[PDB]
Write a protein that binds this ligand. Structure first.
Ligand SMILES: O=C(O)c1cccnc1C(=O)O
Ligand code: SF4
Ligand SMILES: [Cl-]
Ligand code: NA
Ligand code: NA
Length: 299
């Protein structure tokens, strides 16, 4: 494909940087200027000197980048790139919890809607949720939208966690079952199990290490053979970072359809047409920024 070389000429003449999440297609990872989890992506978005950000991720991640860079152009290659977990949390869920627990801080995953983040005291990802919640003064915390991460946070902080909404979860990581753990140990007897904290608690209890995708990268040096309980394209990421090690997905069907809405072709069309421009209403942007900034400073 001359498509790769044409993306690179376009981004260079646009003064653009391509930021990509770890779950992006291999073709997208191979052209990205930076690849990381959502916390690393949020951090990288605070030191962008480029004029344009092309965000190879889901729409609410791109909105976070826009909240952190209101002066810059942020493009999402497809407006259908979205997070099913984040869409489960409505503002009314938060207000109801705030009425019932008036002194609980509101702690939302950074991928939530900008409207929901406007009601957060602080945001988190899987990478920093325990560290942030531990620092909060209150013993009661409103937390969402992922109930499986909420379970993990309650276990690691000892605090009372009120999940909002009740059914919030990521369907990709919810796919994993104890049956998949048992099958992994038979297929790969010498491997260790990396499990993401968005998996269900009984699956997490089987892990050798429980870690966000950034944590999986930091801890892969502890063993040479891993079975990976997270989204399929993280296995590609690990294999390219560590060619000398062995990695295997726990389920080949554990893939995020929203992440896969971004392709090499619509990144090219994104740079060619300067679309689609990400905008956040000023009122909502300002309130969400305060919680995202608190997250960065508390991490
Ligand atoms: O990078 C993360 O925090 C993350 C971790 C697990 C599942 N999804 C995400 C995401 O950003 O959409
Ligand atoms: S992986 Fe799960 S959480 Fe991350 S974007 Fe896809 S649906 Fe949302
Ligand atoms: Cl992660
Ligand atoms: Na991640
Ligand atoms: Na993260």
């Amino acid at each position: 494909m001359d498509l790769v070389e044409e993306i690179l000429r376009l981004k260079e003449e646009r003064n653009a940087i391509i930021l990509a999440h770890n779950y992006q297609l291999p073709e997208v990872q191979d052209i990205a200027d930076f690849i990381g989890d959502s916390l690393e992506l949020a951090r990288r978005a605070t030191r962008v000197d480029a004029d344009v950000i092309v965000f190879a991720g889901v729409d609410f991640m791109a909105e976070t980048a826009k909240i952190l860079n209101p002066d810059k152009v942020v493009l999402i290659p497809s407006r259908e790139a979205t997070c099913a977990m984040a869409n489960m949390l409505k503002v009314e869920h938060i207000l109801e919890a705030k009425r019932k627990y008036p002194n609980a801080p509101v702690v939302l995953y950074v991928n939530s809607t900008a409207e929901a983040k406007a009601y957060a005291d602080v945001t988190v990802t899987s990478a920093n949720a325990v560290e942030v919640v531990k620092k909060l003064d209150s013993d009661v915390v409103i937390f969402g939208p992922d109930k499986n991460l909420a379970h993990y946070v309650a276990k690691m902080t000892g605090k009372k966690i009120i999940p909002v909404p009740s059914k919030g979860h990521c369907y990709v990581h919810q796919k994993f079952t104890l049956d998949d753990v048992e099958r992994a140990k038979k297929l790969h007897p010498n491997a260790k199990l990396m499990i993401h904290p968005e998996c269900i608690p009984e699956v997490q209890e089987k892990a050798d290490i429980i870690a966000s995708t950034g944590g999986m990268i930091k801890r892969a040096c502890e063993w040479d053979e891993w079975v990976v309980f997270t989204e399929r394209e993280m296995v590609y990421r690990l294999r390219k970072l560590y060619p000398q090690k062995k990695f295997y997905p726990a389920r080949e069907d554990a893939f995020c359809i929203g992440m896969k809405a971004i392709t090499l072709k619509n990144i090219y069309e994104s740079l060619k047409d300067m679309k689609y421009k990400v905008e956040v209403p000023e009122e909502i942007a300002r309130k969400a920024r305060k919680a995202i900034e608190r997250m960065l400073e508390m991490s």
